[PDB]
Amino acid sequence: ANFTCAVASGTTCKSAILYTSPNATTYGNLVARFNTTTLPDLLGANGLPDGTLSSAPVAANSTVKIPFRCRCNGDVGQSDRLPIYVVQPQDGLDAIARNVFNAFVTYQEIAAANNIPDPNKINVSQTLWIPLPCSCDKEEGSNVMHLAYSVGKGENTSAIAAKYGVTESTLLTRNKIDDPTKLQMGQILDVPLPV
Ligand SMILES: *[C@@H]1O[C@H](CO)[C@@H](O)[C@H](O)[C@H]1NC(C)=O
Ligand SMILES: *[C@@H]1O[C@H](CO)[C@@H](O)[C@H](O)[C@H]1NC(C)=O
Numbered sequence: 001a002n003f004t005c006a007v008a009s010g011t012t013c014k015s016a017i018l019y020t021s022p023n024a025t026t027y028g029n030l031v032a033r034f035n036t037t038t039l040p041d042l043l044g045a046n047g048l049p050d051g052t053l054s055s056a057p058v059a060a061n062s063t064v065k066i067p068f069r070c071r072c073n074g075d076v077g078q079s080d081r082l083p084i085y086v087v088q089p090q091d092g093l094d095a096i097a098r099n100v101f102n103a104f105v106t107y108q109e110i111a112a113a114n115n116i117p118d119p120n121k122i123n124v125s126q127t128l129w130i131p132l133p134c135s136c137d138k139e140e141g142s143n144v145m146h147l148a149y150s151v152g153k154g155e156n157t158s159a160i161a162a163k164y165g166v167t168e169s170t171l172l173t174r175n176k177i178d179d180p181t182k183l184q185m186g187q188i189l190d191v192p193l194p195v
Pocket of ligand 1: 022023024060061
């Protein structure tokens with residue numbers, strides 16, 4: 001389930017997803033859709049200056065680091081009752097999960113988290129808590145920021161680990177990957193940033 005977290009229940013820390021924006025949008029809109037962080041923190045997480053306007057563009061298909069508060073429940077780490085998603089006229093949990101949130105969650109996880117779904121029957125304008133995966137676990141005794149990462153096509157665990165200043169075996173043990181060569185596009189990795 002989601003990302004694992006083994007520290008005391010109620011533990012709060014800072015995590016992130018590397019978000020792939022389905023459409024052209026702006027930092028201001030992301031701040032709004034997510035509501036998990038303030039604008040200046042979003043800008044800093046993506047290495048942009050103080051004077052940057054909220055209208056700063058994010059191109060379709062490009063990535064944005066989105067920070068949020070993680071809460072651990074004893075088993076798992078989830079974004080802490082945020083972000084909130086309002087169901088649309090022709091939305092389905094699976095389409096929301098996959099087409100809005102990069103499949104960082106499954107429709108089952110969206111189901112369990114909002115208690116009301118036991119099957120997928122939902123109403124428009126209803127608010128859903130989206131439990132983005134996270135953790136506050138340390139990495140071999142050190143403090144890390146956990147980043148949810150969706151594997152790109154043609155990527156390997158070596159280059160992914162290196163890009164995040166992490167050891168490949170760390171990436172592999174943390175994500176219980178027996179065989180690196182089996183890495184799939186769109187597989188969600190828990191990357192423990194040394195930071
Ligand atoms: C960019 O995103 C649009 C959807 O908004 C999609 O139709 C197109 O395939 C994407 N292009 C690339 C280069 O991924
Ligand atoms: C991993 O990906 C990078 C970048 O495309 C490539 O240069 C590197 O050689 C790859 N390693 C393997 C094992 O494929």
